[PDB]
Design a binder for this molecule. Sequence first.
Ligand code: 8F2
Ligand code: ZN
Length: 260
Amino acid sequence: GMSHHWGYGKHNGPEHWHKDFPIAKGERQSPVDIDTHTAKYDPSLKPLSVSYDQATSLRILNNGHAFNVEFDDSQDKAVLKGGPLDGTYRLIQFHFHWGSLDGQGSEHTVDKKKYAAELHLVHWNTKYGDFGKAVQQPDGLAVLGIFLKVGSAKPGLQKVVDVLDSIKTKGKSADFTNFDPRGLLPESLDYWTYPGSLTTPPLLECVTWIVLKEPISVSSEQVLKFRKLNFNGEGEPEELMVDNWRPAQPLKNRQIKASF
Ligand SMILES: NS(=O)(=O)c1ccc(C(=O)N2CCc3cc(O)c(O)cc3[C@H]2c2ccccc2)cc1
Ligand SMILES: [Zn+2]
């Protein structure tokens, strides 16, 4: 990806991605708008299982598109299973997408409603051995999406907010151990699910999306700190990292299922 130049600007944004990543106009692209009235309850959907008790965070990195909190996935620790998933998916990293204003920022939408941000907890199917091989499979990844709305502060997120000053620009990373992702989950695990893809290039169609119905609340100060990050690297013209979200894509031949 040393030649990648896609971004979220006017000249390299989502509308341009298809030129280097033709799958952008594929049959199962993400994100999508979740029409709550069209989504059908699926009684066969088993309960979702989120086991982050042994999660081991290692580092936080500004990759120029977002910031990723990375976990040690060399062992079966933080895993996602159940729900529409068959097998075990291991947590590798989480990141967010947010806007320049509270009225936008999420990638998925609910009845066209846009949230201030969206958290993505990325997991890969252990039957494929590693992340690189998993992304080449239709059921290689499971991403748990959680909407963020602005209101009361999320205590469990503050540790992330305070370390952002150390990774302001692209390429910067910082030690980030002992962070518990369980502090970022809402109370309920009710969710919608559908087959889709990564929302950033290479836009591979390797994701089973599980989007929680209940958003979490974060404070205006917390999201404000997110908006102080930079897309550019150190010593380059300052480009605030905001609106790093891809808009809803055509649902096409897909059905969104509800666990409730
Ligand atoms: N938004 S999302 O669909 O949840 C998503 C999931 C995984 C990833 C991811 O973990 N990686 C690795 C880091 C990376 C760096 C880039 O510059 C980039 O353009 C994409 C990624 C993706 C990635 C996924 C699959 C193959 C290669 C890279 C990114 C986004
Ligand atoms: Zn994402």
